[PDB]
Design a protein around this ligand. Structure first.
Ligand SMILES: [Mn+2]
Length: 184
């Protein structure tokens, strides 16, 4: 069997993906973390900033999927998932603070669940695990924004992985980016 990681980075904003962070970029930092997790396959989704991202970073070893400018980038990423993968670990391109250890833990215990989320000190957060059994439902969401409602639904047995600290910062605004740079 296989485990595929999916990084969603198609979010509209200088592109937010290319903002400087820890000697690299925000997206570069996220991908650096994903590359350490031991995924058999890594899929990255990009939007309108695709060309800019490509020219700024080497995307070696990652399956790049491009959408137009939330968009339904998860739907098209699923099309790339290898047949022998029993599910996906889902990560967001603007959440570079995700710990490699958390990814290894969810890779370990995630496959014994239909859906798994991380339980932080201040609530539910990424990474998520989705079993192949829910790929159809994921594809039928209007956009990437619909995942949040799904992981809080009682329709599936959503399991929780306990993680120390609070939820990684989701870098959308300038205030978010300021908060990210502050913690070092
Ligand atoms: Mn975001």
């Amino acid at each position: 069997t296989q485990i595929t990681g999916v990084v969603l980075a198609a979010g509209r904003s200088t592109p937010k993906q290319l903002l400087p962070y820890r000697d690299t970029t925000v997206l570069g930092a996220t991908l650096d973390v994903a590359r350490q997790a031991g995924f058999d396959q890594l899929i990255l989704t990009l939007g309108g900033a695709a060309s800019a991202v490509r020219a700024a970073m080497a995307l070696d070893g990652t399956d790049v999927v491009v959408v137009e400018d939330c968009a339904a980038s998860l739907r098209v990423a699923l099309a790339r998932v290898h047949p022998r993968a029993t599910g996906i670990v889902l990560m967001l391109g603007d959440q570079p603070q995700v710990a490699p250890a958390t990814l290894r833990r969810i890779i370990d215990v995630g496959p014994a669940t239909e859906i798994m989320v991380c339980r932080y000190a201040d609530g539910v957060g990424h990474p998520f695990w989705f079993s192949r059994t829910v790929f159809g439902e994921l594809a039928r969401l209007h956009g990437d924004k619909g995942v949040w409602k799904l992981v809080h639904s009682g329709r599936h047995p959503v399991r929780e992985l306990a993680v120390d600290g609070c939820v990684p910062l989701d870098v959308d605004t300038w205030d978010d980016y300021r908060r990210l740079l502050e913690s070092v």
